[PDB]
Amino acid sequence: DKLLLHVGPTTIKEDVLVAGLENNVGFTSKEFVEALAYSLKGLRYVMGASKNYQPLIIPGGGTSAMESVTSLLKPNDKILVVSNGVFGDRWEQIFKRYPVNVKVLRPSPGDYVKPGEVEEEVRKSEYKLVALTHVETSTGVREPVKDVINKIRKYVELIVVDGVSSVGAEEVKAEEWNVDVYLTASQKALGSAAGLGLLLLSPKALSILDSQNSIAGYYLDLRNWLPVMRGAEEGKAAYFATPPVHVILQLAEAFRLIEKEGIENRIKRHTMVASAIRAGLEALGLEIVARRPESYSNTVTGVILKVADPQKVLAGTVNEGVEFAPGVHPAFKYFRIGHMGWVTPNDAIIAISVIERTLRKLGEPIRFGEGVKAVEEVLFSA
Amino acid sequence: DKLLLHVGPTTIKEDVLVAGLENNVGFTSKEFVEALAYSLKGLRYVMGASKNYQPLIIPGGGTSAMESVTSLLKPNDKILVVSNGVFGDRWEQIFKRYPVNVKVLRPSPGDYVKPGEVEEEVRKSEYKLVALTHVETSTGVREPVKDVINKIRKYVELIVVDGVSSVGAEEVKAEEWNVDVYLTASQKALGSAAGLGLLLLSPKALSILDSQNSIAGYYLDLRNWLPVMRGAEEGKAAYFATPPVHVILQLAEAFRLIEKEGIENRIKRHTMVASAIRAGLEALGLEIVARRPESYSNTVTGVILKVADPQKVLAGTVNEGVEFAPGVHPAFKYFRIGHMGWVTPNDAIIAISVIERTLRKLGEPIRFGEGVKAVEEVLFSA
Amino acid sequence: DKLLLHVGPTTIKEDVLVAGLENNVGFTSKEFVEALAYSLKGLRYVMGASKNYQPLIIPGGGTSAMESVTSLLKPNDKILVVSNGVFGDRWEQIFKRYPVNVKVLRPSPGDYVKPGEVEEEVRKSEYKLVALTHVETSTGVREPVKDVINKIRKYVELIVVDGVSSVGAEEVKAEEWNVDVYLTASQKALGSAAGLGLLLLSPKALSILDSQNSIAGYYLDLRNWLPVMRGAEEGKAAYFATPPVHVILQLAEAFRLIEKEGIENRIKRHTMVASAIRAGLEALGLEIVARRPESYSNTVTGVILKVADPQKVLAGTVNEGVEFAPGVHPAFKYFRIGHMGWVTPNDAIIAISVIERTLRKLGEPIRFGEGVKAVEEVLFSA
Amino acid sequence: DKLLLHVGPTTIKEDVLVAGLENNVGFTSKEFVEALAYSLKGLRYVMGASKNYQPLIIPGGGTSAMESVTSLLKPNDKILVVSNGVFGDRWEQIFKRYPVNVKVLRPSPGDYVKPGEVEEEVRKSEYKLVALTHVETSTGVREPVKDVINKIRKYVELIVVDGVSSVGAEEVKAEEWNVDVYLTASQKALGSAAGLGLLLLSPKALSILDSQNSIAGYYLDLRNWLPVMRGAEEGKAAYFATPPVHVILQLAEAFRLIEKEGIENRIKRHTMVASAIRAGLEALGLEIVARRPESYSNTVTGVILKVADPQKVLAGTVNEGVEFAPGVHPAFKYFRIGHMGWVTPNDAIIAISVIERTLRKLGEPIRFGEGVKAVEEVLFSA
C-alpha cells in the first residue's frame, strides 16, 4: 500500500502512468506531436502566461532546465544567485563550469534572503542575470519571488526562477511578474513521470535565442530545441534529438487533469493540505526547519528531530507504509515531508498518523493523539 | 494494428511498457536501485565486457551520451571523427561547442571509411580521441569497427564508438576490441522507451574521470553520474540529479528479455530478418542505399526510389499499417526501413508486402509478387 | 510476437485491454454504469435494431446466453433446432436438461440446412421456438438466416439465432429480419475480453419476460437481469448478482472502436480479409471444409489436410508465431483459421505465409509461393 | 484518489489488474492453462485442504457457484438453509427454481443461528444438504461454522458453506472441518477482478458428480467443468465453454500475492484492521449492526445511524474519497464498511477519519476526535 511522500517523484495518478502505454508511438507520430503541443500549452497555463511566452520541454529534469539557461549568456556575463540552500547552490555549481562571473547571497540556515538585501546588491553592482529559487527543497523555504522581482526588475537584464518544487502548487505569475525564465520539472507538483525539464521564456529571452550566440553546449542549447517546440504547436514534427516520447504522453495526461481541476483550486488544495500537516506537527510539539512562518512552503516541510535518528525514522515509516525524504542540510537534524501533486486531505491524515506511531516507538518527545486531531480540525474548516 | 518500423522508438513489447506502471517508486526506492543495478549489468552483457568496464546510464539519449564524452577531454585536445553520414557529422556539431580541434574523414555518399584510411590519418597526426559510428542510421551503413581499431589502437589515446543503431543487434565486443567508450540509447535495438543514454567505459577512460579535470559542463560530466552508478551496484541509493525512474524500470525489463533470448540468438535474429528484407528488395528490383554489401547493416536499410515520391510512400505505408522513416541524405532519393529490437520474421513479410502494395499504387517500377516470395525463401532456410 | 488466430479470444486491441485498468470501480460506480449503458447501446447498433429491442449483457458467454433462452419457455414447449454441427448440437445438449420437446434437422457433414427444408418442417409440425446458428464455428459454415426466417416467420412463435461467431463481422439485421433473440459473446468478432454473453430481445420476447413464468433456473433467468439493464440505461445502478465489472469496461471500449470504424466498413473488412485468405488457400491447392461456397463464413475457415497431421501443424504454427485452432468434426481431418475482430489485411498475409512454411516442412502437397501471391492480389483489388 | 471500501470489488492491487494485459492468450494457450492450474492450487491453499479435495473455477461469481450446488441434488431432496440475512435467503431463492424441499432457520435481526438450534433441526428431520453462510454480508455477521459442523456432521449427507465474504480473510479449514462444498467469488477478500465463482469439493461431493445424475441445468452442472479443471492440473487444455480467460490471469496473480504474504498473516491483518475500525466506531459512540460481539466479521461492519440519512452519508463519503456500501436490511438504518482483500492499517485510519468528517457535517451525534485516536491506539498495539 506504500505511499510516496518524497520530494519527486511523489505518488503518480494511475491515469497518468497508463497514458504511457502505447507500443507503436515515436517522435514523428501524430499522437506524440499532439501530446507535445498540448503539454506546451499546459505549461503556459500553470505558469500564468499568454502566447507571447515560449514554452520548451527538454530531456532530463530541473538540473538540465537550469543548465540550459547558459543559452542566454556570453563569456564574462555577471550573475547574481540568491540561494537559500542546496538547490540555490546548484546554480553556482553549474555556472562554475562556464566562463561567467558569479556572486551568491545566502541567509542564515533555514531562513531566506529578504527582497531588501537583493535590491541592495543589484543597486551596488550591474548584473546580466539574477537567479532565484521559488521553493528551496532542502529546507522547505519559499522565497517571496514576487516581492524580490518588483524591487529588482529595473536593475537587471534577466531574471530566472527555479520553480522545480513550486510550479503546480504555489501561485506562479510568470508574465505579470515579468520573469524571463521560469522553469520546473515533470516529477514534482505536476505529478507526472520523471525525465523532463520545462521552461517558459519571455519575449526578451526569446530574442536572445533568435539573434545572439551563447556559451551553451550542444544538447542543452535551447536554440536546438526551439524548432521542435515551434513545430509541434503548428502540428508538425521536427527532429533535434530523441525526446522521452512516452514520458511526454504521461505529462500531457497530467496536464489534462490539472486543467480539469483548475490551477486556482489546485493551489488551494496544496495550501489546505500543507496547513493541515503543519498544524499536526505543531500540535505534536515538533519544530519546523523553515525559520520564518511566512516562508513555510506548501510542497515540502522539514521536521526537526530532537532525540530520534532521522535514518531510523525513515526506515520505520517505510515499514508503516509511507516513504518520506531524508534531511540534507548540515545545520539541522531532520527529515522531510513531500506534500505535492495529487496529494489529498487523506494523505495529510496518514502522514501525521505514521509520524506519530513511528516517533512514539523511537522515543521522540511528542504529544501522542494531538497530531491527527489538529489535522482533522484544519480539514474540517475547508 | 500499425507497425512502427522506424529508427527508434520501434515497436516496444507490452511487457516492457508495463514494467513502468509502478505509481510509488522514486530514485531512492529499493525497486529503482534494483532496476538500475540490473540494467548496468545488462549493459556489460550486450556490449561484451567484464566487471572491469564501467557502465553508466544517463538522461536523454544517444546525443547526451555522445556529448558526455567531453568528460574525457581537455582544452586543445585533438579529435578525429570518422563520419559516414548524418550521425557521424553530429560528433563534429557537438565538438564545435567545445575548445577542441576536430578533423573529419568522410567517404563517398553511402560508402564507409576504410580501416586503411583511418590508419593512415592516425599515423600522420597525433590524436587524443577517435570517434567511430558502428551503424550510420542515415544510410544503413555498418563500419567495420573491429578492423579499424585493430589498426589504430596503438596510435591513439582514446577510441569511442557510437553504437546507437547497433547495440543489441550487431556483434559488439567492447573489451576484446579495446574500446574506451561504447555508447547507445534506450529506444533502438534494445527496444525500450526513449529517455536514456547508455555508456560503457574502459579502465583507461575511468582513470581519466577519477584523476583529471575536463571541459565538460555540469549535467553531462560523467564524474557527477559515477557515484550514482557505483552506488546502485552496491545496493545503495545516491543522488546527483533525478533520472527518468520509470524509463529505467522499463529498460531493466527489456534487459531481462534480452538475457532470456541470449545475445547471440538476438544477433542471429537481426541478421535473418535483415537478409530476408534485403532479398525482398532485390527481388523487386529496388536498389539499396548502402554502396558496399559487406556494410549492409542489420538494423536499417535505405531503399532508393527511381520514380515515386518518398513522402507519398511514407504517407501511404502508414495507411497500410506500417510507419517507416524518411530518407535524409542529399545524395539519395529514398526512404528507410528500421528492422531492430523485437523485430520478427513475420515483420519482414509485412514490410515487403506493404512496400509492394504501396509502390504498385504509386507507379514505381517493381516486379510485383517476387518480393514476398524471396522473403519467404530466406526465412524458410532458417 | 505470437498472433492469436483462434476462434475467440482472438488478438485483442491494446486500447481494449487497457480500459480494464481501473483499480477502484465496482457495480454501483459511475464508471461502470456508464460503460454498461454504452455497451447496451453498442449491442443495438451492431445487431441493427431500434430502442424497441431490449439488450442484455450477462455473465459467462455464448453458452450462458443460449441457456438463458429457457427464460422464454414453458414445460412441454416444442423446439426445432437447425444444426450444422457442434454448436448447433449444443442447443440440443442444453435443452436436454429442461422439460421440453426437441427436434433437430442436420445436413450432410460440412453442409447447411436449406431454408426449404426448415420451411417444410415448420409446416408439418407446430413449433414454439426455432433455433438457428448464424456461423457454425466447427466447420466455418454460415447459414442463410435471412432466407430461413423469411420463409418460417409466419409458422413459429419465437426465432433465436446464435450469432456468437457472426455478430460484428457479418450482416445482422435483428429488427428488419424479425428475430426474437439474437445472441453473441464478448470474445469473438466483437474483439473484447471473454466473460460475457450478449442478447437482444424483440418486444414479443420482452412481453414473455414481463408477463409469464418460465422453466429458467435462477442465475440464467433473464427476468433477474432486466432490472440491471433497464436501470443502467436510465443512469441508475441496480444489483442482481455481481457482473464481470472490468470485462464490461473493456467491452465498452471495444464498442467505442466499432462505432468509430462503422459497422458497414467492419463487415467489408471481414469480407475482404476472408476472401483474401480463401484465395491463398485455393492457390495453394488446399480444400476448404465448408461444402458450399455461398456458405463460406467470413470469421472461420476450415482447412483440409490430405497428408500432414493437424496436431503437428498446430504445434508448428505456434513455433512460427501464429496460434490457429484444432479441427473438431469427425467427418474431416483439418485445422481452423479464425479471422475476426481486429483482423487486418496484414494478418491475412501472415496467416497464409505461416501456413505455406509449416506445410512445406511437414510434406503436405501444396503450390509453394502461390498462396501469398493470391492474397496480395485480392488485397490489391480493395 | 478515491478508496473502494465496498463489499466487492474492493480496491484491486495494480499488479493484479496488470496481469490481465496479455493480448494474445486464449483458453488453449499455455499461459492460460498455467494460470488456471496455479489458481486451482491457490484455492486449496486459502481453504485449507489437501489434494483429495477438488477445486473448480467457473464463470459468474458467488451466485453461480451457489446455484451449481444443484449438481449434487436429486428431485425431492431435502435441504436445510441456515440464513442470517440477505445472502442466506438467496439459497432459498435459488432452490425455489428446482424440484427440492427447503426449510430455512432464521435468527433475530442481526443475530446468528446457534449451533444448538441447527443440531436440534437436523435431529428432527433428515436432510440431504445443509447450507451455511460464513459471513453474512448484509449485517456483518460471522456464523461459527466449525461449531455448527462438529454438531451436525453425523446427521446430514452434505454440508455447503457460502464463503463469498470470508475466504481470504477469515480462518477456513474445509478438510479439517469436513465441509463438502466451500465456495467463494473472485472479487471479495481474494481482492481480484469480478467474473468467477470458486468451489472446493470433498471426495464425497466428487463421488456424487462422478457416479450420479442431478437436477442441474447445463452451464452450471459442475460435471461439465470437471474435465476442464482436471485437465489444467495435468497441464492439458480442455474445452467446455469459454471461461473469463483474462480474469483468470488476474486471479493467478492475486493468489501469487496471497501465498507471498501467507494465509495466516493475511487473516491476522484482517483481524487487526477490523478491530481497529470497530474501536473507532465505538469511541465515536456509534452502534454496530451485528448483535453478538463474538460474531463481528472481519470483512464487513454495519454502522447504525440514529439521525443522519445513510443515503447522504454515502453521497458525502464519495466526495471525501471513500465509497462505502448501502445498508440493506429492513430492521436497521445503517451503512456498511467493507474492509477486506488488500486492506491496510492506513485504510482503517482513512475510513474512520472520513466517517468523522462526514457525520459531523450531517449532524449525527458523535464524539469528534475520539475515533481516529482509538484506531491509532489499536494499530499501535500491533
Ligand SMILES: Cc1ncc(COP(=O)(O)O)c(CN)c1O
Ligand atoms: C528546487 C530544486 N531545483 C532543482 C532540482 C533539480 O531537479 P532534477 O533532480 O530533476 O534535476 C531539484 C531536485 N528535486 C529541486 O528540488
Ligand SMILES: Cc1ncc(COP(=O)(O)O)c(CN)c1O
Ligand atoms: C547513429 C545515431 N547516433 C546518434 C543518434 C542520436 O540519438 P538520440 O536521438 O537518442 O539523441 C541517433 C538517432 N537515432 C543515431 O541513429
Ligand SMILES: Cc1ncc(COP(=O)(O)O)c(CN)c1O
Ligand atoms: C457458434 C458458437 N456458439 C456458441 C459458442 C459457445 O460460446 P462460449 O464458449 O462463449 O460459451 C461458441 C464457442 N465459441 C460458438 O462458436
Ligand SMILES: Cc1ncc(COP(=O)(O)O)c(CN)c1O
Ligand atoms: C455472502 C454473499 N454470498 C453471495 C453473494 C453473491 O455473489 P455474486 O454477486 O458474486 O454473485 C454475495 C454478494 N456479495 C455475498 O456477499
